Amino acid sequence: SLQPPPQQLIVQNKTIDLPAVYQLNGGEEANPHAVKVLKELLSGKQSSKKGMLISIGEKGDKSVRKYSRQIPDHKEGYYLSVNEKEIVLAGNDERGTYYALQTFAQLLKDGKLPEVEIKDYPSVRYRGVVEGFYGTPWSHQARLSQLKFYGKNKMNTYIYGPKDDPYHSAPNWRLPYPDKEAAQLQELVAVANENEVDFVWAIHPGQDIKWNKEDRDLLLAKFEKMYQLGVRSFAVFFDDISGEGTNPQKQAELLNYIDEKFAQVKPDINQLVMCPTEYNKSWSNPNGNYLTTLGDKLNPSIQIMWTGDRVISDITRDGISWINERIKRPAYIWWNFPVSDYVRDHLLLGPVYGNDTTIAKEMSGFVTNPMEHAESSKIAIYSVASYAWNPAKYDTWQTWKDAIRTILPSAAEELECFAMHNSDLGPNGHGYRREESMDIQPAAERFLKAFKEGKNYDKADFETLQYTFERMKESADILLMNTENKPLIVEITPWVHQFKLTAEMGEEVLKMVEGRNESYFLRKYNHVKALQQQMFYIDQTSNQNPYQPGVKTATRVIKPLIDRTFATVVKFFNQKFNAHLDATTDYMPHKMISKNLPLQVKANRVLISPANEVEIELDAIYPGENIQINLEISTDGKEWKTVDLLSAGLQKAPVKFVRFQFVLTIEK
Numbered sequence: 001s002l003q004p005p006p007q008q009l010i011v012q013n014k015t016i017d018l019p020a021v022y023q024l025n026g027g028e029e030a031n032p033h034a035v036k037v038l039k040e041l042l043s044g045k046q047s048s049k050k051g052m053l054i055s056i057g058e059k060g061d062k063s064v065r066k067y068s069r070q071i072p073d074h075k076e077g078y079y080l081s082v083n084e085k086e087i088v089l090a091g092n093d094e095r096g097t098y099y100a101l102q103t104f105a106q107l108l109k110d111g112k113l114p115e116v117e118i119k120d121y122p123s124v125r126y127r128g129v130v131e132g133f134y135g136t137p138w139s140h141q142a143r144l145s146q147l148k149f150y151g152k153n154k155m156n157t158y159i160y161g162p163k164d165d166p167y168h169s170a171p172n173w174r175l176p177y178p179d180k181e182a183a184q185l186q187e188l189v190a191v192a193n194e195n196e197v198d199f200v201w202a203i204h205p206g207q208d209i210k211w212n213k214e215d216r217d218l219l220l221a222k223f224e225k226m227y228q229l230g231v232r233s234f235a236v237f238f239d240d241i242s243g244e245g246t247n248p249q250k251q252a253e254l255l256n257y258i259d260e261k262f263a264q265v266k267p268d269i270n271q272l273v274m275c276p277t278e279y280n281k282s283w284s285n286p287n288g289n290y291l292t293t294l295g296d297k298l299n300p301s302i303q304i305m306w307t308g309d310r311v312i313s314d315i316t317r318d319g320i321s322w323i324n325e326r327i328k329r330p331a332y333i334w335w336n337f338p339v340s341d342y343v344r345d346h347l348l349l350g351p352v353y354g355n356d357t358t359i360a361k362e363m364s365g366f367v368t369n370p371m372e373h374a375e376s377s378k379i380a381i382y383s384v385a386s387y388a389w390n391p392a393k394y395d396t397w398q399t400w401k402d403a404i405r406t407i408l409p410s411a412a413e414e415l416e417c418f419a420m421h422n423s424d425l426g427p428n429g430h431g432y433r434r435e436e437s438m439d440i441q442p443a444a445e446r447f448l449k450a451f452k453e454g455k456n457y458d459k460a461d462f463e464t465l466q467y468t469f470e471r472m473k474e475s476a477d478i479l480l481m482n483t484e485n486k487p488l489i490v491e492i493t494p495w496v497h498q499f500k501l502t503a504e505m506g507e508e509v510l511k512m513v514e515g516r517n518e519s520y521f522l523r524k525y526n527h528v529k530a531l532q533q534q535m536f537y538i539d540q541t542s543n544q545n546p547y548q549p550g551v552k553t554a555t556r557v558i559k560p561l562i563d564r565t566f567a568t569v570v571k572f573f574n575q576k577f578n579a580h581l582d583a584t585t586d587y588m589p590h591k592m593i594s595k596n597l598p599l600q601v602k603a604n605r606v607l608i609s610p611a612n613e614v615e616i617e618l619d620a621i622y623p624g625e626n627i628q629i630n631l632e633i634s635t636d637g638k639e640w641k642t643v644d645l646l647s648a649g650l651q652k653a654p655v656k657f658v659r660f661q662f663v664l665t666i667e668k
């Protein structure tokens with residue numbers, strides 16, 4: 001499965017052996033990065049004057065003058081041919097030759113090659129990744145791995161813009177990088193060049209920029225330093241800011257000044273990109289004129305980025321038509337998937353879909369904003385690379401499977417199982433959701449409806465659920481020990497542990513359904529409760545970021561199935577035996593009475609779940625920080641003390657009981 005799929009392909013039912021003796025034509029004049037890849041593939045074979053001909057070079061070179069009319073006349077295009085007599089690897093330009101060898105490398109299976117003719121080129125000019133998220137920036141080693149991945153998948157753009165890099169954003173965008181960071185960026189630029197990737201260094205000055213000479217000069221001086229480090233593409237971001245920095249005329253004047261005094265003055269600057277303040281249709285104000293001002297004033301060679309109809313959205317024909325008409329040029333898409341920085345307790349490992357496949361001519365570029373988990377993001381990155389190169393032939397599911405098999409060939413089926421059930425975002429303020437667990441959701445829905453109603457569930461549905469949990473356990477345990485992509489496994493391990501616990505819980509709940517005698521049922525009930533406690537422990541000790549701490553997995557279909565099945569069968573047990581087993585589905589060490597709203601623990605906070613439509617007792621005495629609501633305290637539940645106020649400080653007073661958003665913060 002060639003990825004990305006080439007524009008034009010003709011295969012014959014004949015196989016050629018990678019010649020033991022070959023004659024290289026054009027190795028001295030072709031793209032060195034391409035030649036280097038080719039010599040690596042021919043490492044065990046000898047190069048004599050006889051033997052199979054191998055012609056590599058760019059259009060205009062002597063080596064490929066024969067095939068000049070076969071080479072597509074598109075940037076980054078190439079012509080590739082293999083037959084029993086000769087191999088041709090001919091780019092329309094140097095990057096095309098490199099892309100011919102990236103395809104050539106996929107065709108080489110077991111030392112054999114298919115007899116094939118290929119004419120290929122990208123439908124979208126700029127394709128790649130923007131490290132543009134909030135959270136821990138990708139490590140240096142992660143970024144190096146990313147750049148080699150991009151070259152392999154014909155992504156030619158990497159836009160560096162981590163929101164939390166202090167030399168990228170306010171206020172220290174004015175300061176040059178220290179020497180250590182600068183040397184790293186220098187290495188990144190070189191590795192990008194060797195993999196045929198434009199390294200675009202972005203700056204995010206909007207929150208405190210002054211529209212004066214001083215800050216203009218500092219931004220240009222910063223761009224000059226980055227240029228001395230090797231950077232040849234630049235971006236200015238005005239996203240997620242307030243104040244004077246949002247002025248579209250001033251933004252356009254600044255970008256045009258950079259364009260005329262820097263971008264066009266250097267000999268060798270490629271991309272110049274900006275992000276507007278109103279960067280999706282819903283944030284555009286029809287009472288004003290922001291987008292048409294940038295469209296008219298900004299020099300036309302400058303790119304303008306866009307996320308679609310909403311902050312998080314997929315690109316439609318009507319949507320891109322809407323923006324293009326206003327910015328007077330094809331939008332450069334910033335696609336906010338798989339970025340998870342607003343649902344940080346979820347991994348987003350599902351397929352890439354939703355974007356119209358017929359609108360390649362309507363966009364200048366297409367980049368994905370990924371997760372702070374770099375390796376995990378390669379599933380979506382690989383798929384975007386395929387979509388962007390050949391959208392007409394974009395195959396969502398086959399590309400997702402191909403990505404997984406490329407990233408983790410030693411355990412591809414196990415990663416597919418995990419990713420299949422780790423793709424929805426859960427409820428969130430952007431309203432963006434993805435499908436998850438589609439394969440088993442019909443059997444889960446049938447089983448639960450029947451069980452709740454007292455009707456016989458279908459045996460096949462019960463067995464599908466049993467199979468699912470068994471496979472999840474297998475997949476979790478195999479993934480934990482996989483050593484082929486250790487950085488990937490480091491990233492996902494907390495979710496893999498939670499995933500296994502979910503599967504164990506689901507198995508034990510199904511045995512309660514199979515429930516044969518009272519003592520067996522009780523053992524399973526006690527086991528389930530302990531597993532709930534273990535999932536709480538992981539949720540409280542892993543991924544403790546300040547915004548969405550913890551680890552959630554299989555949230556769309558499976559955890560609701562298990563929670564609801566457990567609650568139902570415990571109700572049935574209590575009815576049958578006149579018992580009073582607790583049917584709560586998530587462990588909570590603290591207690592609340594009055595509401596069935598569950599309490600939640602997040603970091604050092606104890607909170608009542610908000611709802612759409614009271615006494616808290618903690619498991620110990622803690623020093624109190626504050627209580628926030630949108631009021632009495634005690635340590636023994638007998639002697640109380642009132643607190644005035646919504647908000648109220650506790651001043652480290654001992655707290656075990658509270659009585660009256662509803663959140664208590666305590667010291668730890």
Ligand SMILES: CCCCNC1=N[C@@H]2[C@@H](O)[C@H](O)[C@@H](CO)O[C@@H]2S1
Pocket residue numbers: 132133134163239240275276279305306307311334336339341342369
């Ligand atoms: C139009 C291109 C700029 C879009 N910029 C965005 N900035 C924020 C990003 O840093 C976040 O990662 C993204 C997802 O939360 O939301 C918005 S989208």
